[PDB]
C-alpha cells in the first residue's frame with residue numbers, strides 16, 4: 254500500500270484504488286497501473302522533473318529503504334494477475350531489489366523529489382510506475 258500526495262491530488266496504484274478514489278477520480282490509466290484522485294487537504298510531497306536512474310525506495314515487506322539503479326520508463330510485459338490480463342505495462346522502470354505484492358505503493362525518490370511508486374516485482378526485481386512525465390500534478 255501507499256500513495257503520493259501532491260497539491261490536491263492523491264496518486265495510487267490503479268489496482269489498489271479505493272471506492273473513494275474512484276468517486277473522486279481525476280485520471281486513470283490501466284496500461285500504467287496509475288490512478289489519481291482529488292483531495293481536500295494540501296499534499297506533503299513534491300515531484301521530480303529529471304532523468305535520474307538512481308534513487309531510494311521504501312520496501313514495506315522489510316520496513317526499510319534501499320538504494321536502486323533503475324531502467325528508463327519503458328513498455329514491459331507483465332504476466333496475468335488477479336487484477337489484469339497478461340499485457341504490456343507502459344512507463345515502467347525495473348531495478349534489482351526485494352519486493353512482494355503488498356509493497357505496491359512504496360515511493361521511489363531521487364535527489365529531486367518523488368520519481369514513482371512500486372507497481373510490479375519478481376524474483377529479486379522491483380518495478381516502479383513513473384510519474385515524472387505527469388506535469389499537471391504540480392498545477
Ligand SMILES: CSc1ccccc1CC(=O)N1C[C@H](C(N)=O)C[C@H](C(N)=O)C1
Nearest residue numbers: 286334335336352353354372373374375
Ligand atoms: C511489488 S509487486 C510483486 C512483487 C513480487 C512478486 C509479484 C508481484 C506482483 C506483481 O508484479 N503484480 C503486477 C501488478 C501490475 N502492475 O500489473 C498487479 C499486482 C496484483 N496485485 O495483481 C501483481
Ligand SMILES: [Zn+2]
Nearest residue numbers: 303305363365
Ligand atoms: Zn532526479
